[PDB]
Amino acid sequence: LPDLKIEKLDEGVYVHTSFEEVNGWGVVPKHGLVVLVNAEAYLIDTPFTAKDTEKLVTWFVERGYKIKGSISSHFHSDSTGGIEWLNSRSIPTYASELTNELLKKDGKVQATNSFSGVNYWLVKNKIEVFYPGPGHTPDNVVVWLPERKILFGGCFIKPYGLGNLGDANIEAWPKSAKLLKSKYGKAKLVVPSHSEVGDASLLKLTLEQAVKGLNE
Amino acid sequence: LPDLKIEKLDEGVYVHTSFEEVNGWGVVPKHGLVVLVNAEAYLIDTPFTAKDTEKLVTWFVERGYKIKGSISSHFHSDSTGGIEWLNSRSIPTYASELTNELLKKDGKVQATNSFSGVNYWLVKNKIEVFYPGPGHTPDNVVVWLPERKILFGGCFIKPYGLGNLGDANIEAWPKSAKLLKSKYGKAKLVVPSHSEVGDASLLKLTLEQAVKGLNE
Numbered sequence: 473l474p475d476l477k478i479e480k481l482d483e484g485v486y487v488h489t490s491f492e493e494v495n496g497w498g499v500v501p502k503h504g505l506v507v508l509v510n511a512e513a514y515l516i517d518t519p520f521t522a523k524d525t526e527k528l529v530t531w532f533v534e535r536g537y538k539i540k541g542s543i544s545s546h547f548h549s550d551s552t553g554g555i556e557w558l559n560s561r562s563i564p565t566y567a568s569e570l571t572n573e574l575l576k577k578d579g580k581v582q583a584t585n586s587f588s589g590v591n592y593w594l595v596k597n598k599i600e601v602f603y604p605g606p607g608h609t610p611d612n613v614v615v616w617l618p619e620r621k622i623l624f625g626g627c628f629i630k631p632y633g634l635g636n637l638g639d640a641n642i643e644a645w646p647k648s649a650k651l652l653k654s655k656y657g658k659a660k661l662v663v664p665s666h667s668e669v670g671d672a673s674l675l676k677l678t679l680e681q682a683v684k685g686l687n688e
Numbered sequence: 689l690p691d692l693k694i695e696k697l698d699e700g701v702y703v704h705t706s707f708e709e710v711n712g713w714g715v716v717p718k719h720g721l722v723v724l725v726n727a728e729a730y731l732i733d734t735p736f737t738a739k740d741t742e743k744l745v746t747w748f749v750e751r752g753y754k755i756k757g758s759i760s761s762h763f764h765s766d767s768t769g770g771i772e773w774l775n776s777r778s779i780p781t782y783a784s785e786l787t788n789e790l791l792k793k794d795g796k797v798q799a800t801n802s803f804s805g806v807n808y809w810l811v812k813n814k815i816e817v818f819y820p821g822p823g824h825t826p827d828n829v830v831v832w833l834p835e836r837k838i839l840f841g842g843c844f845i846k847p848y849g850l851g852n853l854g855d856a857n858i859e860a861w862p863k864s865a866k867l868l869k870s871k872y873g874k875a876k877l878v879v880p881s882h883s884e885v886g887d888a889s890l891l892k893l894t895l896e897q898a899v900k901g902l903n904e
């Protein structure tokens with residue numbers, strides 16, 4: 473119900489928040505980022521709908537930035553809901569090979585550009601995509617902004633609880649959460665998809681929740 | 689297995705941590721406080737055992753502090769484990785009537801002093817005991833320190849999950865959490881029994897966990 477929000481998080485980094493009604497949760501927020509790189513803008517996850525994605529893109533274009541593309545952290549529509557629109561407007565979309573594979577199987581439009589491997593450099597030294605392994609979804613990846621020490625953890629970061637385990641790999645989440653914690657322990661800010669921005673401690677909390685989750 | 693820990697949290701306020709092995713959780717920490725009121729020390733919750741309670745009391749006695757009293761947040765042994773030792777040394781012990789009634793049914797030694805009501809002053813205007821209502825247990829109470837705006841949530845504050853529900857009142861917890869949040873939303877620090885120290889946001893998280901728990 474609430475309208476898309478676009479707030480500055482740090483120099484060249486904005487958080488975009490869109491909303492959706494969830495079973496028993498009420499209206500749940502979804503956070504993504506827009507990273508500025510010299511008159512160029514990059515979307516870290518897209519809003520749920522084409523509407524907000526269009527709104528998001530226009531906000532930045534009307535401010536002088538050229539939308540260079542969007543990268544989605546995992547296949548769920550809260551990260552990929554705007555790929556359909558962006559593609560139809562010939563705006564480059566990116567998703568990991570596992571994400572596109574999951575998207576196709578779920579009857580969803582795929583990102584135009586895909587990648588695989590542990591690391592993927594969208595913008596050398598400015599925007600880096602990391603795959604810690606299966607967790608929330610088999611494909612979840614995180615986005616590391618080296619210059620600001622900011623880590624967008626997406627739906628993988630779950631400090632207060634794992635959430636729906638339907639498409640999750642609870643058996644491997646702890647291992648993945650451990651690798652992520654050791655790779656980005658120096659993060660100044662960790663941005664979750666469904667809860668407040670915090671610090672490197674959300675890495676630890678996510679790991680403990682995964683361990684607790686598997687134990688059950 | 690880890691040794692009792694005593695760390696300063698703020699002026700005149702220390703956090704004491706004892707440890708236990710907890711079925712499927714590994715070594716779990718238990719936090720309590722020691723509040724200093726002019727050369728006199730007050731224990732907020734005791735360690736699990738007598739030897740640790742002794743270690744705690746001695747740490748402060750050897751520093752010129754008279755142990756003026758200790759209050760237990762609820763009847764479980766992680767809050768009351770040292771009442772026996774303290775009484776044996778004539779150190780004033782406090783617990784609400786409900787806690788004392790539950791301690792009796794548990795065949796445990798009772799606090800020498802009992803109180804009741806929504807709020808009780810262990811030390812007028814310096815240390816407040818608040819009863820939000822049933823939650824983790826039917827008797828859980830919290831301790832508020834007015835000067836430093838520090839709230840010891842005890843085992844009732846569960847921002848990451850409720851924990852064992854065997855002695856809990858899940859139907860009332862959310863109501864109790866609501867009351868605690870509106871009463872202590874001004875807290876600067878909220879100290880849970882089994883997780884890191886945080887701010888007023890732990891109250892909100894707790895409420896949401898209670899709600900989620902009731903629904904589940």
Ligand SMILES: CN(C)c1cccc2c(S(=O)(=O)NCCCCNC(=O)CCS)cccc12
Nearest residue numbers: 500548550627632633634635636666667896897
């Ligand atoms: C209770 N309280 C501690 C919580 C606050 C914020 C988020 C919590 C989550 S969550 O972080 O999981 N977000 C809520 C569910 C959002 C559901 N959305 C989807 O499934 C969309 C695709 S990812 C899980 C458990 C608990 C959460």
Ligand SMILES: CN(C)c1cccc2c(S(=O)(=O)NCCCCNC(=O)CCS)cccc12
Nearest residue numbers: 680681684710716764843848849850851882883
């Ligand atoms: C996963 N991670 C986020 C967590 C960290 C710290 C505490 C968590 C709790 S908890 O805060 O509930 N305590 C953990 C079990 C403590 C066991 N000790 C007792 O039951 C003694 C009697 S009160 C619940 C869920 C999750 C917790």
Ligand SMILES: [Zn+2]
Nearest residue numbers: 546548608627
């Ligand atoms: Zn998801």
Ligand SMILES: [Zn+2]
Nearest residue numbers: 548550627665
């Ligand atoms: Zn999500």
Ligand SMILES: [Zn+2]
Nearest residue numbers: 762764824843
């Ligand atoms: Zn307890």
Ligand SMILES: [Zn+2]
Nearest residue numbers: 764766843881
């Ligand atoms: Zn406890």
